[PDB]
Amino acid sequence: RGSFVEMVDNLRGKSGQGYYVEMTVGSPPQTLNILVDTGSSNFAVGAAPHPFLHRYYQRQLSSTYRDLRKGVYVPYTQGKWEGELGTDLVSIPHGPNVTVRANIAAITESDKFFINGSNWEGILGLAYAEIARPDDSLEPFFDSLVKQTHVPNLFSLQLCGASVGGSMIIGGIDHSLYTGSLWYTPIRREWYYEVIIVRVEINGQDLKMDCKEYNYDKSIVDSGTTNLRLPKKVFEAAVASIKAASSTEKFPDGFWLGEQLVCWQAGTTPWNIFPVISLYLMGEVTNQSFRITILPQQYLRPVETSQDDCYKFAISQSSTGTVMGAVIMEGFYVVFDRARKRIGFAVSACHVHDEFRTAAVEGPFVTLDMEDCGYN
Ligand SMILES: C[C@@]1(c2cc(NC(=O)c3ccc(C#N)cn3)ccc2F)C[C@@H](C(F)(F)F)OC(N)=N1
Ligand code: NA
Ligand code: NA
Structure with a gap:
């Protein structure tokens, strides 16, 4: 243990x-x-x-x-x-x-x-x-x-971003793999590891959508997918927010659809004009939630035509619901606590970052009407 x-x-x-x-x-x-x-x-x-x-x-x-x-x-x-x-x-x-x-x-x-x-x-x-x-x-x-x-009926995953490595602890949690506290969201039904998202902010600005939109028709935690994948309607809002956030630099329109890559010269990638992205997840107690915060480091994937630093945009639209892929998981230690039907998140000890901002897991927040957010 x-x-x-x-x-x-x-x-x-x-x-x-x-x-x-x-x-x-x-x-x-x-x-x-x-x-x-x-x-x-x-x-x-x-x-x-x-x-x-x-x-x-x-x-x-x-x-x-x-x-x-x-x-x-x-x-x-x-x-x-x-x-x-x-x-x-x-x-x-x-x-x-x-x-x-x-x-x-x-x-x-x-x-x-x-x-x-x-x-x-x-x-x-x-x-x-x-x-x-x-x-x-x-x-x-x-x-x-x-x-x-x-x-025991649990395993945890630390996916360390970019070659890649990490840890699967079968039967337990290893405390050296994370910092601060774990925060837990209920697994809503045991099929995929389905969770409920209750609020999404881009640089602390809310997408302000009816929250059934973040879980249409499910939200899941999936290490076998690369992207953060967002329901089409949420994707549209997310990306316009990120487009606006970073209108300081410019890139082609294809880029936001993952239809072309974009390029700055080795060590000129300007992370700081890209917003952080928070997802608030239903908490364990009534009216209580917590949030996880990721970085451009997670959503701008290195690809290696060109002798430069070229990245792919790895938030994508979906018709299968939200998918918290390896984009999300690489920031966090993620505990699949099957015995208590819940999933815990903590800041990864390994996650890729810079000097100004880090991935984060914070609570408690008061959110009302969180049971409205599940799609039926
Ligand atoms: C069974 C399936 C699958 C995954 C991969 N995954 C990868 O190739 C891959 C590649 C990179 C990373 C990372 N990081 C993770 N996974 C390849 C073939 C598959 F059939 C189907 C896939 C479906 F979406 F199709 F249902 O989603 C999931 N969850 N698993
Ligand atoms: Na047993
Ligand atoms: Na620890």
């Missing part, structure tokens, strides 16, 4: 490619790098020699593999994967000292799923059964882990 030194720094990544953890599956163990994804619920690994892949699960070599004689076809907006369902022994070598029998989807066919040049070979879905595929009776990895061992 409180101290997990063998789990610190157990995540690796390349910028724009996600954060992965080393895992092993089968007997003898086969090592794979696996993307950590709080916005899905399948454990799925490549299992055939797709050319983008460093390595893949070879079921024939595992003496503990148990076939479920059952297929799954999983499309997303950015294409799909199909696989064969089975169970096998799974450990996390820089995780708890345990081995569990878990569902595995062995990916035999995929399109636009694996990244060419990436160093990972599957996805670890950490959200709940309700969105597991084919249906909610395919028990997710984390449910199997808690069912079979004494690991």
Whole structure:
């Protein structure tokens, strides 16, 4: 409890490619790098020699593999994967000292799923059964882990921004990973890690929208998405506010749609004309909320045509609701306290910043009528 030194720094990544953890599956163990994804619920690994892949699960070599004689076809907006369902022994070598029998989807066919040049070979879905595929009776990895061992029902993530690294503490919270206090928001329903946003300010100026707009039709915390993604109507307001905030410099109109990158010469990026962005989240007590504050450092992503510092705007519009992606998560230590159905935020010990402003987590604020903000 409180101290997990063998789990610190157990995540690796390349910028724009996600954060992965080393895992092993089968007997003898086969090592794979696996993307950590709080916005899905399948454990799925490549299992055939797709050319983008460093390595893949070879079921024939595992003496503990148990076939479920059952297929799954999983499309997303950015294409799909199909696989064969089975169970096998799974450990996390820089995780708890345990081995569990878990569902595995062995990916035999995929399109636009694996990244060419990436160093990972599957996805670890950490959200709940309700969105597991084919249906909610395919028990997710984390449910199997808690069912079979004494690991407590929680994990926390510190995603350190830009190559990338970080920590997944399975079973606990490590106090050296954050500063100040944790503040908790209720997980509104266990499917995605759904939360409720109650107010959004751009440089402390409120978007003043009916708050059902910030959660139309949900808001979720997702390490498997890069952007801060905002419902279209909120996106429009957000971006006009940021446009105005920084009319001091100018950039093309394409840039705010993530349709072109923009460029200042090495070390001339003027952070200080970009506003901070606060999100107030429903608190644990009636009429009480807290706010998290992020920086241009989180929303202007480094990309590496040009011999300069070029960034991409990584707030984007959405028709699936708000998505607090790695843009948000990289500022904070985030505790997925499944046992108490809540999610805690604290200032990350690692987050990228400058001399004037830092990411922040502050409370308590009085907000009335917060139950109006959930979309039904
Ligand atoms: C299952 C899915 C997914 C994620 C990624 N993620 C990444 O490639 C990635 C890349 C960079 C970073 C960072 N930082 C994080 N993730 C790639 C393929 C997928 F199918 C689908 C995706 C969907 F939105 F489609 F549902 O959202 C989530 N939550 N997971
Ligand atoms: Na248990
Ligand atoms: Na601390």
